[PDB]
Structure formats: structure tokens, C-alpha cells
Copies of this chain bind each other. A is one copy, B any other.
Amino acid sequence: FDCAEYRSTNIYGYGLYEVSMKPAKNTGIVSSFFTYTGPAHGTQWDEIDIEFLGKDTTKVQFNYYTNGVGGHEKVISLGFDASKGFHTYAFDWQPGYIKWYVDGVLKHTATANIPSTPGKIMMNLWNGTGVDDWLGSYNGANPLYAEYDWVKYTSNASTDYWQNWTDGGGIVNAVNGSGGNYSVNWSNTGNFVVGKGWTTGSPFRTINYNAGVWAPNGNGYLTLYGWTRSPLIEYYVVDSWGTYRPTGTYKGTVKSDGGTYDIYTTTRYNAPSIDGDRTTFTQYWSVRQSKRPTGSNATITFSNHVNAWKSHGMNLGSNWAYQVMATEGYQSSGSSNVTVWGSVFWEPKSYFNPSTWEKADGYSNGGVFNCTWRANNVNFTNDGKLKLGLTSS
């Protein structure tokens, strides 16, 4: 028996691992997506799994090994047959937990003896021997296939600041979420500003976020927000908004991260600021000429804005205070869900890219794996999908 394993050439650490896949269906096999490192690579055996036991594809199995100790199996009922269509499975791996998801919904959290060694991303399909109680016995049916549409890994941002300010009008339910994530649900408010970011901003920072939810019902801004002191200046890089587009005195424009922004300035007197709730300071703005798409990864190269501002005579303070990816609102209702992240590894799997992936070939895992890995069983379909096969002879 011949089986298939596709594995990354690089190693990856803590962060969110997502895959879109359709597992094979048959007694005695497994289709999976997992991270792995072990003794053959000079490390302890640290692995995090997503496994579909072909005997019953209406279930998914989650597991993990740390220093070679597994025993963390959690089987969950899916509510659909995973073999009948593509679905997104994922696990967020951090030092104190692992959270697994199905089509974006949280289904299981683990906290005991979590792995810590960066591993490779892997995907395999195989038939077992000696584990009939676990997989059912394999009946030789072939060929069988497991398909994967895309793989994505996003590393941590290291945001250290949480901002949750409301003027007291209406309701602002802000949620300080895990890592760089936050969400806000608001109802008929006065003014507020909620966001995650950094305690000390920087003119060189590159902010990467994703707004999984951007649904202002009225005046809301999805915006890089921060301050400087010496002098006191509040700045904004607005990517999207609600029913009102912020403007002021026009200075010019700046092209950055695929968008063009209008640059403005506005002055403020007697309003809440970081140096006291009744002060006098300017606001610097970059406002996108049209709302940025949300729901996907977006980058704000803050230095291009700082520089274009410098160029139009707008210079910032030298005492840098907080810097966040915010949701601000006024006299409105809405929801927002935003994640600030570190870096993304994106693989569309449209074909075999030999710099970032390798096809296991010419050897068997032995043990319960009753098959040899073959690069010939790792192919790409026309519609740009990884197709893993289990064949015989």
C-alpha cells in the first residue's frame, strides 16, 4: 500500500493554523492536518493534530503530543459529513493553550501540557494496521483521496496595550480577547474608542490586522489611532467607516498599502485628551478615499503616513504614547471584531512549490502506518487543490 504526505520546508511557531479541506471516507484510514517536530529532527516530539477517521467523517478528532506524550484525544460531532464538502478547520496554538475551530466556531480548548517546539506543517492520508479499535480495519478499497484547498499560518503580534474608553453615553460592550483580538458591540452611544495595540507607538511600526467583523450601523471608524506628547497630537489612519467620512482641512494625498488616502488636519479645543480632558491640540489624518475591504488581512505601513505628513508640514510629538488599531464611534450602534497579527504564511495549494513544501517519498513511518509514502501520490488538481491519494500495488 502506497500513501501520501505533504510537509512544509520551514518550521512554524505559536499562532493560528487554518486549513480548508475535504477528508477521504473509508474504514481503516486517516486524513489529517497537523504540526510536527520530533527526535529525527533533533527535538522532543511536539505535534498538534486535526484528524478525520475515515470510518466516520461526521466526526473530527483533535489531539496533541508533547515530549512524545499524547492521550489528549477529543472527538467532536460535526453536524455534517466532512467528506461531502470543503470546510475550514483551525487551531490557535499558544504557550498556555490550544483552541480548535470548525468553520470559525470554537469547539474545544486544551490547557494541559501544551507543546512548545516550532514544527513543520503537514498533511497526510494513510491506512492503519494494529489500531482496529481506533480506525476500524482497512479493507483495501482504493484509490482513495483527501483534498486540501488552502493552508494559512498567522504569527503573533505582541500587542501589549488594551484600550477601552467610553464617554458614558449609551452602551459599549468591548471584549479584550485572546492575543491581538478584540470585539465591540455598541448601542446608541456617545463617543468611544476601543482597540488593541502598543503602549509606546512608533513611526516605524507596520500594523497588520484583519477586521473579521466591520458592521457599524451609523458613525464608526476602523482606524489606526494614537497619540504623541511634546506636542500633544492625536493621529489617525482611517481604513473604513460607517455613515460618515472624517475630513478636515485638506493637505494632499499619500499612496500606501495599495490604497490612496486624503491627508487632513483638524484642531480641537476643550475636549478630552491624554494630557487632561480639556486641552488644545491638533489631529492629523490619513483617510482612505473609499472604504477598504474588510474580512481579509490588511497592512498599514505607518511610516509611509508619518513621512507623507512630514512632507505637508505635519510633524509628530517626541514622547510617543499609545498606538492602536481602533474602532471609534459616535451616536451610533454596531459590531466590530478585529485581530492585530504578526506575519502570514499563505498557501493556495494551486501547485507543487518545492521551496516551501516537500513530498514524503521512499520510506514508511512504520508502526501503525501500513503503507509507504510516495511523491507520486501527492498531486494537484486543475482547480488548484492538493489531492492526496491512497493506492495499491
Q: Which residues of A contact B (CB under 8 A)?
A: 199, 275-276, 350-351, 355
CB pair A350–B275 under 8 Å, yes or no, is yes
Give the residues in chain B near A350, CB-CB below 8 Å. 275
The CA of A350 and the CA of B276, in the complex, are separated in Å by 9
Task: Indicate how many identical chains form the complex.
Answer: 2
The CA of A245 and the CA of B350, in the complex, are separated in Å by 35
Closest residue of chain B to A301 (Cβ to Cβ) is B318
CB pair A199–B355 under 8 Å, yes or no, is yes
Give the residues in chain B near A199, CB-CB below 8 Å. 355
Q: Which A-B residue pairs are the 4 nearest by beta carbons?
A: A199-B355, A275-B350, A276-B351, A275-B351
A55 CB to closest chain B CB (Å) equals 37
Can you report 4 residue pairs joining A to B where beta carbons are below 8 Å apart? A199-B355, A275-B350, A275-B351, A276-B351
A276 CB to closest chain B CB (Å) equals 8
Give the residues in chain B near A275, CB-CB below 8 Å. 350-351
Give the residues in chain B near A355, CB-CB below 8 Å. 199
A13 CB to closest chain B CB (Å) equals 22
Give the residues in chain B near A276, CB-CB below 8 Å. 351
A174 CB to closest chain B CB (Å) equals 20
The CA of A275 and the CA of B199, in the complex, are separated in Å by 41
A178 CB to closest chain B CB (Å) equals 23
The CA of A351 and the CA of B350, in the complex, are separated in Å by 57
The CA of A275 and the CA of B275, in the complex, are separated in Å by 53
Closest residue of chain B to A382 (Cβ to Cβ) is B276
The CA of A351 and the CA of B355, in the complex, are separated in Å by 51
The CA of A259 and the CA of B276, in the complex, are separated in Å by 29
A363 CB to closest chain B CB (Å) equals 28
A97 CB to closest chain B CB (Å) equals 28
A386 CB to closest chain B CB (Å) equals 15
Closest residue of chain B to A274 (Cβ to Cβ) is B351
Give the residues in chain B near A351, CB-CB below 8 Å. 275-276
The CA of A199 and the CA of B276, in the complex, are separated in Å by 45
The CA of A355 and the CA of B350, in the complex, are separated in Å by 49
Closest residue of chain B to A346 (Cβ to Cβ) is B319
Closest residue of chain B to A355 (Cβ to Cβ) is B199
The CA of A351 and the CA of B274, in the complex, are separated in Å by 10
A322 CB to closest chain B CB (Å) equals 11
The CA of A350 and the CA of B350, in the complex, are separated in Å by 59
A383 CB to closest chain B CB (Å) equals 11
Closest residue of chain B to A275 (Cβ to Cβ) is B350
The CA of A276 and the CA of B350, in the complex, are separated in Å by 9
A337 CB to closest chain B CB (Å) equals 27
